[PDB]
Amino acid sequence: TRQEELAAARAALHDLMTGKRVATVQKDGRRVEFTATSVSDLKKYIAELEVQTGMTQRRRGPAGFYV
């Protein structure tokens, strides 16, 4: 249950980036709203979940040097 979690979180990230993270909804007496996260913490959450799950490698180890 990590792949669909990744998909949902990434879709939420993309829509928040573009236009589609709705915060409040109102129905003239039936209204609610949700708290909002931050772009940076959402991105690092995405990175953490993808690295912990079984998808492909995304980051290598340091960097070699030679003359």
Add this chain to the structure above:
Amino acid sequence: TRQEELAAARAALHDLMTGKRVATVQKDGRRVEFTATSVSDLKKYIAELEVQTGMTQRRRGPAGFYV
């Protein structure tokens, strides 16, 4: 009784992160707000809950060096 609360906190983290951490709910004449927190505190709480629970290893004792 650590597993159920660990799972609940993880699901709440995901739900808050994506779009659905509802803060106030209002039906006609009936408002109620649940206080909200940051995300770093939630992450450190879920990490400490997992580590105190008899879960798998997540930490390594420093790191030795060899030539």
Add this chain to the structure above:
Amino acid sequence: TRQEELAAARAALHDLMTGKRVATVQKDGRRVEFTATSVSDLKKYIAELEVQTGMTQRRRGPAGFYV
């Protein structure tokens, strides 16, 4: 009379962390609200109330060194 105190403090910590510390409740003509407490201070209170009780240790003294 401290075991239930610890239980209440832990439950409050858990619900506040996930979703369930209501800060205001409004009924038509009947609304009340409670002051909110920071998570760090609640953790301080949890730790001190737990250690002052006769329950088992969660803490040990400083560690020495040897070659």
Add this chain to the structure above:
Amino acid sequence: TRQEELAAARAALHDLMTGKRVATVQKDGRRVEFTATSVSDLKKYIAELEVQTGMTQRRRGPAGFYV
């Protein structure tokens, strides 16, 4: 009239800490609220009165060293 002061202060501290310190109450034409006090200074005050009254020993006189 000191021990009951101590008990009331501790009870109020616990109530504030968990969820219970009611800030405001609204009835039909009854808006009554009380200013909140920070947990840090509340703890300082309760500790001060506890050590002022005839309570048992909590503080100790520094700490000597010996080889």
Add this chain to the structure above:
Amino acid sequence: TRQEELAAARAALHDLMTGKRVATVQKDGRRVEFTATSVSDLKKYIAELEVQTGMTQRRRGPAGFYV
């Protein structure tokens, strides 16, 4: 599906920069609002998604010197 949301995000950025990112819309008790972002994060998101997708080169690797 990369270029589609690339173009969507670019268009959203152009809109926000110009004039008409809808912060909130209401009509007779039907009120909704969308969370806002920052131009910096939107531009860096555009850049990173462009790098992830198969767009042509935009940045290069340092620059050597020679007399």
Add this chain to the structure above:
Amino acid sequence: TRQEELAAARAALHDLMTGKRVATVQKDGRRVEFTATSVSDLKKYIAELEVQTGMTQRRRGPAGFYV
């Protein structure tokens, strides 16, 4: 399809500078609020778009020194 974007952005900057970047619109029940941008990021967008598009020579590099 970048020159018309440049023209639109320049016109938007001009009207925003003078008097004519509308924030809110209200018609007795229908209201629309648009996100507020700044001037620095707007002119940064203007500069980046004009340099990337087929706009003519406007920028030159370093400087020479001689006696």
Add this chain to the structure above:
Amino acid sequence: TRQEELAAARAALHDLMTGKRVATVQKDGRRVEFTATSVSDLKKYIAELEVQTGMTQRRRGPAGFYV
């Protein structure tokens, strides 16, 4: 359109300085508002558009010294 653009911008700047940078216009049922801009940014925008325009001398090249 540089000349009339400059004239309109300068007149708007003068009006903003004096008394008539209208922030919002409200008639019963219809309320709108325009975004508010700073003054220094407007002044520097005026200066740069002027120097871009083929108007008269406005700047000079550093300064000369002689005993």
Add this chain to the structure above:
Amino acid sequence: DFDNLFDAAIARADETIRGYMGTSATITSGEQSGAVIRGVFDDPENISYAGQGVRVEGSSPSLFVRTDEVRQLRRGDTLTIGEENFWVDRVSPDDGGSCHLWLGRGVPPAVNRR
């Protein structure tokens, strides 16, 4: 359970308000017979003059309990709130997670079913 993502929130809201406000009363008679249910009892005023002066000043008790246990409540059955005694005379339709209960005093007047 709730196919809205919002009815769960409204149910949490209603249980929270019923827990932090109101009282618990024991249903009397009816198909529920002996049972205890917690609601939020309020009671405004109502005045009627009838003739010139025949003022019959009374009260309009309401309970507003959740919909789950209010089912198969019917009308003729009674209800005791704390120490006082009442009886249901009207039930509002569900607003999503609850409904208002209107309470008369004393014994319900007859049945007059047929």
Add this chain to the structure above:
Amino acid sequence: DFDNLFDAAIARADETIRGYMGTSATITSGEQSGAVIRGVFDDPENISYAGQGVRVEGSSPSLFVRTDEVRQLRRGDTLTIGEENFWVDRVSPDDGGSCHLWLGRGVPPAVNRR
């Protein structure tokens, strides 16, 4: 799509509030026959007294559905709210992105037109 700059935002808001608020109602009979729509259902309580005491306390169901999915809905056909079934008594004109479907209970009473 439409020369509004505002109705597009209205439609997006309507879709969002349909998604986050309301339930899925399926229609039966009529030219739509069987179809599934998302709409926010409400049921305010209304009472009439008529003569001496004729309390006929009832409900006024409304659904607030988008006109696009309910084009040529007519009036005679029925509707089902999940397990419950209704019948459209009237349809409001669209306000720009949707309208309100006002419903009655049971079966529509005859036709009575010719």
Add this chain to the structure above:
Amino acid sequence: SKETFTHYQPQGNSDPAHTATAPGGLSAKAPAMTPLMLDTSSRKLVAWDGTTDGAAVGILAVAADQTSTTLTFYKSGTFRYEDVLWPEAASDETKKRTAFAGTAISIV
């Protein structure tokens, strides 16, 4: 209280044992050093049933399961018959011995 420190000699020849990686579709926990064949329908990697003849493609190098999107397996070399996790379907030894014929994998 008789601990036997048996030496581990998985391979049985001097030929090199190269590895390769490919996405896998194991439906059960697959221990290392296990024969596996390419799926007929999905063309994915699954443990060899022991009944299909010649369909086996290699020997699993490292342990994996359903969660493992891809996996590494031996593609060249020669191993011993004893330390191969044969499926229980494989009854007679001779077909197991000849199972990897025609590939870079051999058994002894």
